[PDB]
């Protein structure tokens, strides 16, 4: 008859919530990250169909926390602009977006003060009949970004700790929700750029097959629709001004950087080819129509909200600014290049954190950024018109949706190497997932050997991960030891197989079924078997002592 046999290193897994670590004086690519692995091993799991859900992927929330945590830490040692909150006597420089302001500054010696001046943008100034104050003075103290930092969105690779694995959905037309017949396993993600933006997603990944439109629920007009493009659209933005910096000493080793202007003033703007955009829009509308088969499609401007939403926000590698994209989110489009006007802020409120504020220093000389539009965020108007037309608008604001637009292909699971199966006996990477239980047993070492040390503000995470990996490893080894199966990969025991545990044919089990399928059926009695196994060894130990005593 059949007996219990223990297998260690079987290719099965379950959804898990763990912590991933960062693989590369940048603001994001900090010194605490590890070197990347230049050769990812995309092992194809043929005959394995995993189900993904980008809308419940904890990786996104983890990413969000990571980005913020780093940001805050990076600006920790930077100058706090406390003494800046003084009476501002301002005049003019019709592009009157810049005001020349004078104020009283406290010198190195507390007993002494003097006059000083700086150029500020109207957007950063609040009327207090020509006296003003800095906008932040009634909310919090803005921290001046340290003069020697880099805000370039250097791509970050996420890697799993030993015992865990990252699955990829390689189905180029996957909607981000459902089965992925085309699935592979990797140790790390690719390099994803921490691009902070709204409306139009820049410098992201392009679709590999076609334009894909995905959402949590198209029937829910309170949710955002994410569209990923296959063909990129070039957009170039520039700030054609002599923003000469000035160094103002506001304390004992604390320098404030003020803006100055040498020449004249021209508004910043973006340049996007009309013909290009038009084509892209037409293509997107077509795909939308497929979901909304008997209606017209119209693109309009933002319904309203904070500047950060109504306009296109992005970091041009320098000073942050916002552009008016009403010329793009439209139905009437010209072939000629479209110029979009923009405005610049010195005082920036990151994300949606109240009380958080940073001040950006001026960059001497002009700036020009060449970037690609890779996708965008749209929302649909509620209700329905007799005109049988649906209206879509730009939106965003929650950076999690930006991260979600890149990490949607990844899923994190934990490997459960210990399995039990019925056999006819009595005692005395992960590619095998697609193989049958029998054949899969020939790769137990290949898998098991990589479940311990595969790894060889981020510091604490790496340390925690290391400990966890050890705990799990030892736990399993302890069990194998107790059951008298130490050092074995396939261990036949002295416990008989139950009839209530399975009614499957032995041949089907080993020749047809895979370990994943088996687990889902036999797991019902996991603890039952373990208990019996422990009792068996106890019996054996006393029997050995009995014999030894002779």
């Amino acid at each position, epitope marked *: 008859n059949l007996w219990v046999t223990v297998y260690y290193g079987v290719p099965v897994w379950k959804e898990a919530k763990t912590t991933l670590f960062c693989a590369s004086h940048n603001v994001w690519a900090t010194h605490a990250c590890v070197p990347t692995d230049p050769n990812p091993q995309e092992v194809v799991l043929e005959n394995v169909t995993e189900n993904f859900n980008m809308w419940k992927n904890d990786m996104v929330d983890q990413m969000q926390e990571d980005v913020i945590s780093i940001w805050d830490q990076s600006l920790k040692p930077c100058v706090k602009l406390t003494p800046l909150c003084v009476t501002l006597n301002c005049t003019n420089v019709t592009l009157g977006e810049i005001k020349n302001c004078s104020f009283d500054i406290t010198t190195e010696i507390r007993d002494k003060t003097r006059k000083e001046y700086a150029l500020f943008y109207r957007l950063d100034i609040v009327p207090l009949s020509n006296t003003y104050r800095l906008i932040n003075c009634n909310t919090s103290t803005c921290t001046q970004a340290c003069p020697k930092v880099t805000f370039d969105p250097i791509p970050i690779h996420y890697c799993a700790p030993a015992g865990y694995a990252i699955l990829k959905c390689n189905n180029k037309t996957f909607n981000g929700k459902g089965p992925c017949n085309n699935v592979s396993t990797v140790q790390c993600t690719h390099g994803i750029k921490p691009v902070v933006s709204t409306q139009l997603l820049l410098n992201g990944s392009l679709a590999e097959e076609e334009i894909v439109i995905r959402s949590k629920n198209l*029937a829910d007009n309170a949710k955002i629709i994410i569209v990923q493009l296959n063909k990129s659209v070039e957009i170039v933005c520039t700030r054609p001004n002599n923003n000469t910096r000035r160094s103002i000493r506001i304390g004992p080793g604390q320098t404030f950087y003020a803006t100055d202007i040498i020449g004249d003033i021209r508004q910043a703007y973006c340049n996007i080819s009309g013909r290009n955009w038009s084509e892209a829009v037409n293509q997107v509308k077509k795909k939308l129509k497929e979901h909304f088969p008997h209606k017209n499609i119209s693109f309009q401007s933002s319904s309203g909200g*904070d500047l950060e939403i109504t306009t296109h926000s992005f970091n041009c590698g320098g000073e942050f600014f916002y552009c008016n994209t009403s010329g793009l989110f439209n139905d009437t489009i010209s072939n000629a290049t479209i110029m979009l006007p923009c405005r610049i802020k010195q005082i920036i409120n990151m994300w949606q954190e109240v009380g958080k504020c940073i001040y950006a220093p001026p960059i001497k000389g002009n700036i020009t950024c060449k970037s690609d539009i890779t996708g965008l965020l749209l929302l649909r108007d*509620g209700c329905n*018109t007799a005109n049988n037309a649906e209206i879509f608008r730009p939106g965003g604001g929650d950076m999690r949706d930006n991260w979600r637009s890149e990490l949607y292909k990844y899923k994190v699971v934990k490997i459960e190497p210990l399995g039990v199966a019925p056999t006819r006996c009595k005692r005395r990477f992960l590619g095998a997932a697609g193989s049958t239980m029998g054949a899969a047993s020939m790769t137990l070492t290949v898998q098991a050997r990589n479940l311990l040390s595969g790894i060889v503000v981020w510091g604490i995470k790496q340390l925690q991960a290391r400990v966890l990996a050890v705990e799990r490893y030892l736990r399993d080894q302890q069990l194998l030891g107790i059951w008298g199966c130490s050092g074995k990969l396939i261990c036949c025991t002295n416990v008989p197989w139950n009839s209530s545990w399975s009614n499957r044919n032995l041949s089907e089990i080993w020749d047809n079924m895979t370990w994943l399928q088996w687990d889902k059926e036999i797991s019902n009695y996991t603890q039952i078997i373990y208990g019996l196994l422990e009792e068996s060894q106890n019996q054996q130990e006393k029997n050995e002592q009995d014999l030894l005593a002779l």
Partner: antibody
Framework: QVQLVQSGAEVKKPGASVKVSCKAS????????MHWVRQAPGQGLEWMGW????????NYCQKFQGRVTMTRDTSISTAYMELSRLRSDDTAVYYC??????????????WGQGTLVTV | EIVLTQSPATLSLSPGERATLSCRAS??????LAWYQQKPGQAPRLLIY???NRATGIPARFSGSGSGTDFTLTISSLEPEDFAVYYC?????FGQGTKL
């Protein structure tokens, strides 16, 4: 507990505009979307739109586009709605409402007293 | 779009009895439904959500079920206090409701 407190009833002349406030308490103001819906005087309810206090983002019912606008002030946990070009058919009780869960926010578990507006 | 229809428009019922209220839609919405109680001069109150779950403070005798495009609210042990208007809701779409 939580509650929504709306302004009192108001009477305007046709063509004019009305402003209706709604103060929230008992929870994080920016935790959930605020919805506006009006109850017609002897008929079913008609959804107006909603606002997201985190960014002031809005979504208006198509049929009122260009007539209604919404905003907010987080410092006083108060939402605001305004309707211009008022008509006689706009007479209704405008309710301030909040959903139960941040995930499915259409479950309007929490309601204000409603504000009656006429011409 | 989604158009919700309920019936019977009105129901003259007595205490202790049982009755149900239908709700239909032209499109499948799985189970994302809600039912609201409406009394004269009062604010709307959530009764049932997900077409299965009772709202806070709602007695067990209030239930309902449905799927896809055909849903129904069920109320047992009817009371005089139930003589109100009940609405069927899906997303921003409100039905006409019925009166007991």
């Amino acid at each position: 507990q939580v509650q929504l407190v709306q302004s009192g009833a108001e009477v305007k002349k046709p063509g004019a505009s009305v402003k209706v406030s709604c103060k929230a308490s008992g929870y994080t103001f920016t935790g959930y979307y605020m919805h506006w819906v009006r109850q017609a005087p002897g008929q079913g309810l008609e959804w107006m739109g909603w606002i997201n206090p985190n960014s002031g983002g809005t979504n208006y019912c198509q049929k009122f586009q260009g007539r209604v606008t919404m905003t907010r002030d987080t410092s006083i946990s108060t939402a605001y709605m305004e309707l211009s070009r008022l008509r006689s058919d706009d007479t209704a009780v405008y309710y301030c409402a909040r959903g139960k869960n941040s995930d499915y926010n259409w479950d309007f578990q929490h309601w204000g007293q409603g504000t009656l507006v006429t011409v | 779009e989604i158009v919700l229809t309920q019936s019977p428009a009105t129901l003259s019922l007595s205490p202790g009895e049982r009755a149900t209220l239908s709700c239909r839609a032209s499109q499948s919405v799985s189970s994302y439904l809600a039912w609201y109680q409406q009394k004269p001069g009062q604010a709307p109150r959530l009764l049932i959500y997900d077409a299965s779950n009772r709202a806070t403070g709602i007695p067990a005798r209030f239930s309902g079920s449905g799927s896809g495009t055909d849903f129904t609210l069920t109320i047992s042990s009817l009371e005089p206090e139930d003589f109100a208007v009940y609405y069927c809701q899906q997303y921003e779409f409100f039905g006409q409701g019925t009166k007991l």
